[PDB]
Amino acid sequence: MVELTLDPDTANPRLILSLDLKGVRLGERAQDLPNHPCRFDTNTRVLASCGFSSGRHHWEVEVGSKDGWAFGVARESVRRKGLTPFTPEEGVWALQLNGGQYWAVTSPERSPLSCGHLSRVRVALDLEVGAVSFYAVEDMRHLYTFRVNFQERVFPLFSVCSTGTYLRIWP
Amino acid sequence: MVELTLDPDTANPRLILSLDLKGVRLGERAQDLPNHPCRFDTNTRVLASCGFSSGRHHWEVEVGSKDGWAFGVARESVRRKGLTPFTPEEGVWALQLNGGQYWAVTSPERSPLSCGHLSRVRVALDLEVGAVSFYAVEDMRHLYTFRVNFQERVFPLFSVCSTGTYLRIWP
Amino acid sequence: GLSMLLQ
Amino acid sequence: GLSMLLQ
Ligand SMILES: [Cl-]
């Protein structure tokens, strides 16, 4: 279990981060922040400060009941400027709540999961075998696995594209 | 008045054009269409098939009561791929209904209009003096004029970024 | 909300 | 709505 914190340098300026850098929601208006090259200027995304080049790590994510969130992992080279598609080909591997449906974000078609509700999810990243996996905490039931030949550093990823929902890292 | 039709080849694939190519709304899904260099692949935009190099020209636009439309004119060179700002700098001169209020889309700040409920708007393009003007059809009361030194072909512009609003050319 | 950015 | 394209 890794103790991750959200990287405010990467955060889209409409995002509101909690003071302990665990939590994220979407704000009504853009803040005026330094325009670092690492900052997402269009997509409503934020990374963890810690990335992983090798080994196996896991963490947990508390999720809002309402639409608008997506989380998982991103390769470092994910483009930060302009609108990027939210897809595996563009360097993002994530679960999403949208239209009340839980999705593994595959492309060109997303993959609907059968899970009725999620309070907390465990993300497990394994660069030894080359996969990222999601589990519902209640009884560690498997939700989805992306198999990726990861060829660069890989960051925990968080996205909130509407008000009234949130994500929060645990612990 | 000029007899205009929406250019199917320019239309964002999420837009649904009417059979007579005068009406436009936003669909639930991206259609499978040929990826012409002229097609807007991100911004919810469509041009008319006819653009203008010189002279005076006018046309009428029927407008939905709900938020999400913008219309007026665009220069031929308006970027078609990736997310473009909707500003005069990026080659768009338009009125917009957003947040239950009517705007002329200036930047960095939009210019409020002072009109009642709009149903139909006459657009008048003058490439001799270099101007686009907007009138409420009921009694041709003036809404707004952009003065622009137009240095290339100018195309009627239509955009709809929400289901449940629309634009429609007349005649 | 954010939909207007695609105008 | 189109907000989700900004995910
Ligand atoms: Cl889909």
Resolution (A): 2.2
Q: Residue B78 has which token pair?
A: 């308006």
**CA-based nearest distance B28→chain D, Å:** 8
Domain locations in chain A as residue ranges? 8-170
Residues 6+ apart with CB under 8 A from A19: none
Whether B83 sits inside 8 A of C6 (CB atoms) is yes
Domain A8-170 has CATH 2.40.128.50: no
CA-CA-CA-CA torsion sign (A127, A161, B71, B33): positive
Count the alpha carbons within 13 Å of A135 in the hemisphere toward its beta carbon: 13
| Residue B30: closest CA among B46, B12, B8 | B12
Cα distances from B123 to residues B42, B61, B76, B157, D7, in angstroms, run: 25, 8, 18, 11, 36
CA dist., res. B118 & res. B97, Å (int): 10
User: What one-character-per-residue DSSP string does B53-94 give?
Assistant: SSSEEEEEEEE-SSS-EEEEEEETTS--SS----SGGGTEEE
A145-148 contacts, C-beta under 8 A, 24 or more apart: A146/A72, A146/A88, A146/A93, A146/A104, A148/A88, A148/A93
End-to-end CA separation in angstroms for chain B: 8
CA torsion A100→A102→A103→A109, rounded to 10°? -40
Q: Residues in chain D whose beta carbon is closer than 8 A to a beta carbon of chain B?
A: 1-2, 5
Taking the C-alpha atoms of residue B110 and residue A154, their distance in angstroms, rounded to an integer, is 40
The DSSP result for A72-100, as a single string, is: EEEETT---SSPPP-SGGGTEEEEEEETT
d(CA D3, CA B169): 27
Q: What is the largest CA-CA distance in chain B?
A: 42
Contact by Cβ (8 Å): B107, B87: yes
Residue with tokens 């100018």: B154
**Is any Cβ of chain B less than 8 angstroms from the Cβ of A83?**
yes
Nearest to A158 by CA among A36, A60, A90: A60
For residue A15, which amino acid is it? Answer: L
Chain B: nearest CA to A85, how far in angstroms?
Answer: 10
CA distance C3 to chain D (A): 5
* A 7-36 near D (Cβ less than 8 A): none
User: CB burial class (10 A; 0-12, 13-18, 19+) of residue A152?
Assistant: exposed
| Residue for token pair 């500003």 | B87
CA distance linking residue B92 with residue B83, whole number of Å = 14
Q: Please indicate the experimental technique that yielded this structure.
A: X-ray
Q: What gap in Å lies between CA A103 and CA A123, rounded to an integer?
A: 15
Which has the closest alpha carbon to A12: A80, A72, A67?
Answer: A80
Residue pair B155/B2 in contact (Cβ under 8 Å)? The answer is no
How far is Cα of residue A153 from the mean position of the Cα atoms in its chain? 15
